[PDB]
Each structure stands twice: as structure tokens, then as C-alpha cells.
Assembly symmetry: C4
Homo-oligomer: 31 residues x 4
Amino acid sequence: XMKXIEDKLXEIXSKXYHXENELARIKXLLX
Amino acid sequence: XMKXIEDKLXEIXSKXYHXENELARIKXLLX
Amino acid sequence: XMKXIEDKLXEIXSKXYHXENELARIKXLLX
Amino acid sequence: XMKXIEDKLXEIXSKXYHXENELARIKXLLX
């Protein structure tokens, strides 16, 4: 349950690293 | 309630696939 | 509390619309 | 716990600012 929820919000705070870094990839190609 | 919350965090962990893949679309056009 | 949490996950499921649509802006300029 | 969860959903509603603003960076370079 709660600890499922918090350790999904683990995955988001990874996807929101790979968000920033793979934007900063693109802004590389264009900058 | 809890199970609403966890199965929204389902939708985010979809939107955060369609995040990655439609960035990786763009980085296609530019790469 | 819970209902704070679920109606933040309202805001994310908006930001994750404005995510998709303002990527699909960019993929317009490049497509 | 709950207050961990809500103040992670603080960090997301930051990452989802730095989302918007560093897309609007890119859409600068291209607009």
C-alpha cells in the first residue's frame, strides 16, 4: 500500500532524472 | 481511495512511457 | 490529506496534458 | 508517511516547473 505508493513516487522522481537529462540530450543537439 | 491513488500513479507510470518515447520522436527528427 | 493527495495527482494528470501537447508544439516546429 | 508522500508530490509539482520551462528553452531555440 503506502510503502507501493511511496517507492512509485522512487520511479517517478527516476523518470523525472531521465525527463531532465534526456531534455538537456535535445537542448545538446540544438544549444 | 488508496487503490484511485495507486492505479493514478498506472496513468503516470503510461504518460511517463508516452514522456520517454514521444522525447526519443524528437531526438528521431534531430539524432 | 488523502483527497490533497488525489486532487495533486488532478494537477499532474493537467501538467502531464500541457507534457503531451506543448512535445506535440515541438514535434509542429520540427514533423 | 502521508506528509513524505505529499511533500514528494512538492518535488513533482518543482520538476513538472523545470518540465514546462526547460520545453519552453527548446521551443526559444526552435519558436
